[PDB]
Every structure is written in C-alpha cells, then in structure tokens.
C-alpha cells in the first residue's frame, strides 16, 4: 500500500518531460501496433473513412526504472500526463477523437526495467483520395500514415512490434462496409522529407473493392431494358405514326429520368465516370431510334415493310451488343 | 550530458517573460512564414468558402533563447510553447479553424543555438472565398488566405515568405473533386493606415472548374431534346396526334431536366450561364410546338375563309439554334 505510494512519488523526482529519453545519446525507438475494432463507413462524397483502433506504443525510458515488490506499475492518466510520450500523429487524419467516456481511454504501464507501454483507444477519420474514373467498377487502397510530428529521423524512429503483416490486426467482425469489400491490408514503413527534416512514416493500406450488384440492378439493367424497348418500336407497322412517335418520346423521357436518378446516386464530381459514358451511349441509342423513325416516316407514301426498318432491326441490336462487349471487357478486365 | 541540457533549458526559461516580444525596445522582429499544404477539400459554392489543412511554420530570432555548448537543435515538447512568446498571427478570412490534437496537440517548438525559434502548427481552417458564379460552370475562382498580426504594427513585427516563391509547397499535389488548381501566388504587403502599417501575407489560388460532367449531364441532353423537337417539322401537318404528342413531350422532358438539375446542382439564387442555356432550349421547344399550332390554325381555321411554313422552319430552327449556340459559347469562353 504505502510502498506503491512511495514508488509513485519517487518516480517523478527530477524527471523532465520536456526531454525525450536518451536525448543527445541515442535514438528513441518506438514499437507500435494497431488492433482495428471496426473499419467504419467509407464516405465517397467526402473522400474519407472512419476507423476505430487500439493504438499501442512501447519504448524504453531509463529515467523511470524502479525497484519494488511489484513488477509492473499502472499509472493514473494524471500521472501519465507528467511523463514524456511520443507525439504520434496521423498524416492523413482529418478529425480524430480520443475517447474519454466515461474516463480517458488511455493506459500507461511501466515495467521494472523502464519499458513503457502506452495503449489508447482512438476513432480516426482519414482522407482516402479516390480515382472514380472506373466507377462503379473501381478499387482503392485507402492509406493510414502516422508518425512523429516534431522529432526527425535522427531522434525518434518507429518500428512494428512484430512482423509488419501481423502487427496490424483486424477483428473478424471489424468490417462495417455497405458499398465496399475489404480484401486485405498491406503494412509498410518509409521516409518522408519536409521543410523541417526527414521523418519516419508508418503506413497501412486497406484495399477496398466496390460492390457492383446494386448498380447493375438499379441502373444498368433498366437502361438496357429501356434501350431494348426503344428498339422494339422498329417492329411496329410504319402506318402507326402516333404510336411510334409516342413510343419514341416517352422512351426518351424514361431514359432522362433514369439518367438523372443514376447521377443522383453518384458523388458530386465533375469528371466523367464509366457509368456516365454508359448512360450517354444509351441516350444516343434512344435518340437515334427516333431519328430513324422520322426517316422511315419521311418516305411512307398496301405499304411494304420499310427497308430502313429492316436494316435497323439488325443494326441497332448489333451495335448495342458490340458496345456492351467493348464496355464490359474494357472495365471488368482492369 | 542530459542533465546539462536540462540545466541549459532551465536557464533559458528562468526569467523569460512571455509578455515581451524579442527586441522589445528595438527593431521589429522579422517573422518568416512557410506553409506546407496537405489537402484542399469541401470547396463550397453555397457557403462561399473552402477548407484546407496545412503545416504552418514560423521562424523568428529571440536572443533570450540563445544557448551555447550544445551543437544540436533542441526539439522540445510542444507544451513548452505555452512557456514562450509566439507571434499573434491570425487568418483574416478564417470562419472556423482548429488545431488537431490526436494523439497530442500537433505543434512543434525547435530551438537553435543562435536563438532562432521554429514554431510549427498543423491547422485545418475553413477560409471564406467570395465567388462570382455568373459564368458557372465555365468559370474561374480566386480564393485567398490572409495572414495578419492582430495587435502589432510594422514597427513591432514584420512578415516575409521564408524561401521566397518556394515558401508554399504541396500545391501541385492537390486534387480537388470539381476543380483544378492552375496557379498560386504569394503576396507580401503592408496595410497602410493612419495609425500605422500592418504586415500582411496573402496566399492565393486560381481554380478552374471541370466541364466534363456538365457536358454529359446538362448540355448534351438538352441539345438532343431540342433536336428531337425539330422532328415535328418532318411529319405531315395532318398527323395532329403525333406532332402534338412529340412537341408537348419534349416540353415535358425539358422541364424535367431543368427541375432535376435545379435540385441536383448547388442552390445559387441568381442567373448563371447554365440557367440561360436551359431557358434558351426551353424557349426553342416552346416555339417549335407553337409553330405547329400556327400551321394547324392556318390549314383548318382560316382554311375556308401550309407546307411553306414547315419548309421555312426546317431551316430556320436549326440555323437559329446553331447561332444561339455560337453566341453562347463565344460569350462564356
């Protein structure tokens, strides 16, 4: 009882938290590992994702060696604020939260030999730049880069506690993704240079593939059916001018409605995606089926089946099938 | 060794008064600033502001913090910033800003033996940017960031870009969703007033809006609908059901496109180039339907008391619409 209090009071006598351990003598090596409790939602509109992690950091501080009956000392967060800790920050973090409900979710442990373990529970919102040119058949590698903010490569170096593949552990039920599929993660470390010097950066990349079935049912299938419906009018007799005219214009309106809804399901970007080109081609096909009828009607003087209609019943399904094969082989083979 | 550094730091912080600037009674302290831009995001036309995250470094010399006998630059804990003097630098057009604090407050204090102090901050700030969208979406924007000292004139403090034109880095690595940074500029100037001159730094960009999405979703469908409304001119005048249904369905389609682009696009309550083009196409399909109404009245109403008007329209409508496009694209480009 009183021995613990004595050791706690004796620990901080003469300690200076403003100085890193081994200042001017060696490099402070920090061993880190991450346990991801949940890989939260990925926001396409904001180009960011949320992740809930248990961040663990271990290092050696000779100034905190103690001798006593106990082998491990557990520090109160108030006492943990009086001891130097690495200033680890996330390079691509946008707005992170250090949970303190109902108490600060931090834990500092000291072994008898002066080795400190610092575990904290964090919710990190990090930016994931995306190339949406192949939307909705795109794949991304959302990064998570962290490192020291103030200490250069010559002062503090980060390392993974175990082999890098096994250092970052994701829970079995961790994935909380509706639109993506977490294929895996790669763990690596590198060196960056800024105007303040060289820094060590620890990076983890999570590889996500978007689910395509939703866009197939909501957008691709209705567009294909609408184009087939527009080409169906080629089999009506040429004397039904109001019928084929209403068919053409209402198919154009249906395609316009589908295009607008399909765009409303895509984040607001100003470049052209793959679905934008698919919709534009379907729009061109529906427009052409009506220009074709206008050309058939311009020569309708019993009347025979128009040779324009006969050629269009073959050309339009063939041209649309060729476009479909080119489009899918273009994007499903990347 | 380490105890020597501890006593050197104690001597430096012994008697230091954070209420006095360096060279309090002498020449102004020159403060060099550089910015490393990490990313730009949420360029909002509705709120007329943009959000950027940057590493903001400030160098200045304080002879009170000069130490000898240590050949190393002393990078100290960030909380020592609360024990020193730092410039009262604020962003004039900032609306909401904060310093990241995970896992700790993202700031740095590096001391050099000659007394030079490096004070770095990681700041995410939402800066106001008044945008002129009369040419939207064929527009350019100029968004700035003003850096000023709150309570010090040029007699007390001075600002300059450390490194000159290379002070700001990371601009070319930015990738905005619907923009494209063309160029950026650095301006150092004094705001001259009767009381005195105040230092000011200005970082400005030039944003060029991408047009591909607007081409595919706004202009091309409206052009196709307008061309479809001309099909009525190649149908016999006695096909009342076909020509009326085509005309009024093209009017309905144009209305659908206008209203859905109104909902999809940001709420900008004044006339833009996109609104002018959509209104022009709506007028063209309106006149295309009114032409048929005139033809039908000529043939059936004033008959007892019609291919010429259609032949005339088959040329005038494509020609007038092409001239309208020529004037539109020459005006806004």
């Amino acid at each position, epitope marked *: 009882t009183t021995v613990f209090t004595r050791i706690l009071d004796r620990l901080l006598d003469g300690y200076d938290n403003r100085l890193r351990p081994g200042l001017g003598e060696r490099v402070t090596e920090v061993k880190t590992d991450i346990f991801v409790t949940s890989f939260g939602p990925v926001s396409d509109h904001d180009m960011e994702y949320t992740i809930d992690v248990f961040f663990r950091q271990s290092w050696k501080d000779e100034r905190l060696k103690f001798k006593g009956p106990m082998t491990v000392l557990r520090l109160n967060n108030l006492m943990a604020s009086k001891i130097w800790t690495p200033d680890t920050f996330f*390079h*691509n973090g946008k707005k992170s939260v250090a949970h303190n409900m109902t108490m600060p979710n931090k834990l500092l442990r000291i072994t008898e030999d002066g080795t400190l373990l610092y575990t904290m529970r964090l919710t990190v919102r990090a930016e994931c*730049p995306m*190339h949406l040119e192949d939307f909705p058949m795109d*794949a*991304h*590698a959302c*990064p998570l*880069k962290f490192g020291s903010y103030a200490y250069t490569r010559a002062e503090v170096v980060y390392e993974w506690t175990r082999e890098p593949a096994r250092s970052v552990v994701v829970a079995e039920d961790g994935s909380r993704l509706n639109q993506y599929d977490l*294929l*895996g993660q*790669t763990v*690596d470390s*590198g*060196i*960056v*240079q800024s105007s303040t010097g060289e820094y060590v*950066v620890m*990076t983890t*990349h999570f*590889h996500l593939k978007r689910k395509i079935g939703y866009f197939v049912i909501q957008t691709y299938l209705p567009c294909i059916m609408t184009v087939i419906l527009s080409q169906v009018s080629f089999w009506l007799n040429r004397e039904s001018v109001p019928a084929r005219t209403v068919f053409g214009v209402t198919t154009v309106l249906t395609m316009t409605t589908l295009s607008i809804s399909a765009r409303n399901s895509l984040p607001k970007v100003a470049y052209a995606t793959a679905m934008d080109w698919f919709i534009a081609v379907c729009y061109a096909f529906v427009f052409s089926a009506l220009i074709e009828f206008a050309t058939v009607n311009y020569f309708t003087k019993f009347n025979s089946v128009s040779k324009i209609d006969r050629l269009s019943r073959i050309a339009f399904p063939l041209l649309f099938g060729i476009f479909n094969l080119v489009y899918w082989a273009t994007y499903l083979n*990347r | 060794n380490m105890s020597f550094v501890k006593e050197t730091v104690d001597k430096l912080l012994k008697g230091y008064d954070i209420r006095l600037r360096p060279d309090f009674g002498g020449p102004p302290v020159c403060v060099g600033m550089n910015i490393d831009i990490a990313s730009i995001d949420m360029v909002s036309e509705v709120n007329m502001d943009y959000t950027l995250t940057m590493y903001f470094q400030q160098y200045w010399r304080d002879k009170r913090l000069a130490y000898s006998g240590i050949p190393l630059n002393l990078t100290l804990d960030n909380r020592v910033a609360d024990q020193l003097w730092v410039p009262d630098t604020y962003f004039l057009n900032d609306k909401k800003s904060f310093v990241h604090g995970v896992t700790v407050k993202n700031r740095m204090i590096r001391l050099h033996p000659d007394g030079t102090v490096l004070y770095g901050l990681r700041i995410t700030t939402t800066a106001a940017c008044m945008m002129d969208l009369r040419r939207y979406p064929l527009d350019e924007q100029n968004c700035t960031l003003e850096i000023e000292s709150y309570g010090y004139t040029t007699d007390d403090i001075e600002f300059y870009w450390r490194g000159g034109d290379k002070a700001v880095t990371g601009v*070319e*690595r930015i*990738e905005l969703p619907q923009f494209s940074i063309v160029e950026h500029r650095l301006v150092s100037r004094n705001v001259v007033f009767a009381t005195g001159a105040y230092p000011r730094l200005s970082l400005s960009f030039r944003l060029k809006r991408n047009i591909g999405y607007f081409i595919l979703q706004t202009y091309m469908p409206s052009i196709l609908i307008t061309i479809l409304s001309w099909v009525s001119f190649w149908i016999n005048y006695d096909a009342s059901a076909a020509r009326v249904a085509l005309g009024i369905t093209t009017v309905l389609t144009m209305t659908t496109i206008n209203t859905h682009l109104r909902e999809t696009l940001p709420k900008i309550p004044y006339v833009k180039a996109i609104d002018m083009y959509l209104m022009g196409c709506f007028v063209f399909v309106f006149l295309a339907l009114l032409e048929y109404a005139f033809v039908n009245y000529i043939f059936f109403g004033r008959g007892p008391q019609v291919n010429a008007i259609d032949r005339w329209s088959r040329i005038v409508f494509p020609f007038t619409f092409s001239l309208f496009n020529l004037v539109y694209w020459l005006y806004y480009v």
Partner: nanobody, 107 residues
Framework: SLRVSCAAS????????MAWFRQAPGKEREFLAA???????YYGDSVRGRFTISRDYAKNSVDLQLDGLRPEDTAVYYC?????????????????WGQGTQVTVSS
C-alpha cells in the same frame, strides 16, 4: 553517381504511386523504390540508403539517383506507375510500365 529520369505523358500521375523496378537477367523483377502522392518514400532492403527517388509533380516525372553502384545492379530498370492495389511492392499492382533502360556496371 548516375541519375535516371522517367517522363510521363498522356496522363497526369499526381495522385499515382510512381515506382522503379529492377529485372536481373532471367531471375525476376525486383522492387527498388517508390513514392506516393504524399511524398512518402519506400525502398527495398538491398537499396536502402543507396538509391534516392524524387518526383517532380510539376513536370510529371520521376528521377532515380544511383550511388555506390555494384556489378550486382547490372540489370534492366523499368519505370512503373500505379495505384498500389494489393501492395505497392508487387509488380502486379502497376499497370503503366516504361519501355525500360539498360544499366551496365563494370569494375
């Protein structure tokens, strides 16, 4: 000291990971260095501290600085650019590949 450049045309690689790869005669394709959008530099164990990778985002190009060259480095050098899907060190993750450059070292 040898400097090797790699000019990229037809596409801006501002937000792509640009890497260098070495292919010994008949053995395999070996990862040497890489740099992503955030200027983070990655290097292989055999070339750690020896080779320097730098990206000119304005000119859209990537340069490699080779120092302390050895006869073991005599191989074909390629320039690669990709999104780093399923590891930025695997050659299968890169799509755009340069025609290659031959470097011969004699001692």
């Amino acid at each position: 000291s040898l400097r090797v450049s790699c000019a990229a045309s037809g596409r801006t690689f501002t937000t792509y990971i640009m890497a260098w790869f070495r292919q010994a005669p008949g053995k395999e394709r070996e990862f040497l260095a890489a740099m992503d959008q955030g200027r983070i530099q990655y290097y292989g164990d055999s070339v750690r501290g020896r080779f320097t990778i730098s990206r000119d985002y304005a000119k859209n190009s990537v340069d490699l600085q080779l120092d302390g060259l050895r006869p073991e480095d005599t191989a074909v050098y390629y320039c690669a650019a990709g999104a780093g899907f399923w590891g930025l060190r695997t050659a299968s993750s890169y799509h755009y590949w340069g025609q290659g450059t031959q470097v011969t070292v004699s001692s």
